[PDB]
Structure 1
């Protein structure tokens, strides 16, 4: 079960429906006994740019500065900047991580992206030796709560923007699952800019209604890492037994692991029935 929950919001206006959603989640989660902690990126005036200032003290190779190594080193010896360390503290303690933000240019707002690049340091959020399903945040569950200007049909298979599942992949898979996170069904609240009041009220209440049991939900599907040869010799390719056995399957495994076949419907929006 979960006790602690971290809500990371990415939005400047407090009058925004996004801000409303964050409160709605804290309210609802508290009532159920969760200890909520917040990360109001804009309110915290968070720094989204990685640089040799995230490492406090002498770098190992000042001439040739390599962010990864330096910050992995800094994490180990305790020289990460206070603000990055702070966020890594909330996370370390969180069981459930909610990401609330408006969809911008088909991704997380720049400030949220920067948050990941700085907070998710190696050794802390990931190691090559244990990527994906075997990562550090594997004991935690995360969730995207996105708001979009476009209608949900623009994001449908025949939608002019294309399958919302492809858009989601880079984030739920590339960023979240790559660290061990169990990714729950995203809370997609389409066309918010064109939703009436009564409709908007209901939305909030639904989000809260969902959050009262968010933890017992079955997570989205991702190809287990046991299906690959996680060694460089193999180039991290999908095991030969698996490759062959999968050939009789009409559907691929996930959006990313489509194998040039048919992507399973809503692989990134709905958890396996």
Structure 2
């Protein structure tokens, strides 16, 4: 078969529970014979800000800077900053992109938000038209593997946080589905800091075990119904 996996990883501490989930992914996917690449964004000191430094050539309109217009142009001309094109090459080759991160404010850490903002540019990840089911990364799979401070019960329809699915919408639908990815079901590892060292061990092994059969999974239907019900 032969599959390539990119893990986009956003945690500052190699000994953390996120680091353990990234490491078990690399170990199990490597064991299976997959080709594996990890973008460890804090180690890379990955630049999160969307600025005019991300285009190196003559701007389309140097008088009034529009990041979307300028990057779309720079993508077509090949004048994006090289850190963006280095990530795009990894995504272009990947069959599966796994994002591994702690939930910050019901979303990704800013450094990973900046990866989405800068790497998934128009022309590369989507065109207008050419989005959602027609997005440019059609054929690829994506998977969010998230850790939380809040417990699974806090993340239910009647807990303080509401259902976990509700915070997934901007990431699954607005970002990944928009770019054409098929979205695998999220891995959510709840409250590892509260949990006993046994329960943590179990959450790590549950992810490892799921990865054994990841290429047999079908995606979610990434719709408003799946996220919010009715």
2:129 matched to which residue of 1?
Answer: 129
Gaps of 5+ in 2: none
The residue correspondences of 1:191-206 to structure 2 (distance < 5 A) are 191-206=191-206
Say whether the 8 Å CA contact 1:2–1:96 is kept in structure 2.
Answer: no
User: SS of 2:121's equivalent?
Assistant: coil
Gaps of 5+ in 1: 224-251, 265-273
Does residue 116 (structure 1) correspond to residue 108 (structure 2)? The answer is no
1:41 matched to which residue of 2?
Answer: 41
TM-score by length of 1: 0.82
2:85 matched to which residue of 1?
Answer: 85
Q: How many angstroms does 1:39 deviate by?
A: 0.5
Q: How many angstroms does 1:254 deviate by?
A: 4.0
Say whether the 8 Å CA contact 1:6–1:97 is kept in structure 2.
Answer: yes
Q: How many angstroms does 1:33 deviate by?
A: 1.0
Pair member with larger Rg = 1
Does residue 69 (structure 1) correspond to residue 69 (structure 2)? The answer is yes
User: SS of 2:137's equivalent?
Assistant: helix
Q: Distance in 1 between matches of 2:41 and 2:106?
A: 19
Say whether the 8 Å CA contact 2:2–2:35 is kept in structure 1.
Answer: no
| CA distance 1:3–1:36, change in 2 (3 Å) | same
TM-score by length of 2: 0.96
1:156 matched to which residue of 2?
Answer: 156
Q: Which runs of structure 1 show a deviation greater than 6 angstroms over 4 or more consecutive aligned residues?
A: none
1:24 matched to which residue of 2?
Answer: 24
User: SS of 1:136's equivalent?
Assistant: coil
User: SS of 1:22's equivalent?
Assistant: helix
Q: How many angstroms does 1:200 deviate by?
A: 1.2
Higher relative contact order (CA 8 A, sep 6+): 2
> Between Structure 1 and Structure 2, how many residues are aligned?
230
Q: Distance in 2 between matches of 1:106 and 1:11?
A: 16
Q: Distance in 2 between matches of 1:150 and 1:253?
A: 24
User: SS of 1:147's equivalent?
Assistant: strand
Deviations along 1:9-33, one digit per CA (max 9) or x if unpaired, are 1111111100111010000001111
